[PDB]
Amino acid sequence: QVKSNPRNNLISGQRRCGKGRNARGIITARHRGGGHKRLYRKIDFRRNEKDIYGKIVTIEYDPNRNAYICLIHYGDGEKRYILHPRGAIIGDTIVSGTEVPIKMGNALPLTDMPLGTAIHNIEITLGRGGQLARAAGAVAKLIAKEGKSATLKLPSGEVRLISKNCSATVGQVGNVGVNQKRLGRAGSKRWLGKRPVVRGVVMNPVDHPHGGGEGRAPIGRKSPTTPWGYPALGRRSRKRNKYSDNFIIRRRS
């Protein structure tokens, strides 16, 4: 399950460093900072190298995502990491291509997938690399396919069209019990580089739209508000006309 190897060439130290500071150096994404140093594992999301026979040597921990990751070999000797599929065991064999068996960890275009399958690691764009359903226990069913377009039900529940020529991988993503963890203490959050958050109602009127009333503030604001002055609850922020809209059918519920 978890045993540390030496470092394969896939593990580097190069990275953005200030978390949540942009160019201007300002904090943009709040609450980050602190927390253990990490190294970047170079995942292979594309899986674009076709028609060679890959073998899972080990299963390893990754700090960066909550899934697991597998070191896989080839006969050619190239080594990649892949996301760990759910139920896959060391010694297993995987392959990507067009005409391929359908089993755990194999990767194929959506032209060749039998309907009803459970998929992860889904490209929305040809050769761009896999994007959708990359987290622990995440999975998406391929419900129907018609014309040049295939239909999925994403782990958010949202049903959406994508291209039939985009690669994807069978099997759900491993390490399913990760959200069953209970951190138990403050320190355990801080280890993840997630700093403490101050409730709006608490800060002074200059600092935030629910500002100090005398004793304890109900929010008098006629509405719950962002730090920046927008309605906090149920105001849809999706760009009205965004290009994706023809593709999206039912919205997550």
* Residue ranges binding Mg ion (CB under 5 A): 7, 197, 199, 210, 212-213, 215, 217, 220
Q: How far apart are CA 196 and CA 126, in angstroms?
A: 40
Shortest distance (Å) from residue 159 CB to RNA? 9
Closer of 108 and 133 to RNA (Cβ): 133
Least Å distance between CB 89 and RNA?
Answer: 17
220 makes contact, choosing from Mg ion, RNA, none, with CB < 5 to 8 Å by partner type, with: Mg ion
CB nearer to RNA: give 102 or 157: 157
For the chain, breaks with the C atom over 2.5 A from the next N come after none
- Answer yes or no: are the C-beta atoms of 48 and 209 closer than 8 Å: no
Name the DSSP letter for residue 140. Answer: E
Closest CB 195 distance from RNA, rounded Å: 6
* Closer to RNA by Cβ: residue 145 or 221: 221
Query: Residue 112 or residue 231: which is nearer to RNA going by CB?
Result: 231
Q: What angle do CA 19, 175, 119 make, to 5 degrees?
A: 95
Residue 176, classed as helix, strand or coil, is helix
Name the phi and psi angles at 201, rounded to 5.
Answer: -50, -25
240 binds, among RNA, Mg ion, none (CB under 5 to 8 A by kind): none
CB of 10 to RNA, least distance (A): 10
Task: From the list RNA, Mg ion, none, pick the one residue 65 interacts with, judged by a Cβ distance below 5 to 8 Å according to partner type.
Answer: RNA
Place of tokens 């129907």: 144
Distance CA 12, CA 32 (A): 21
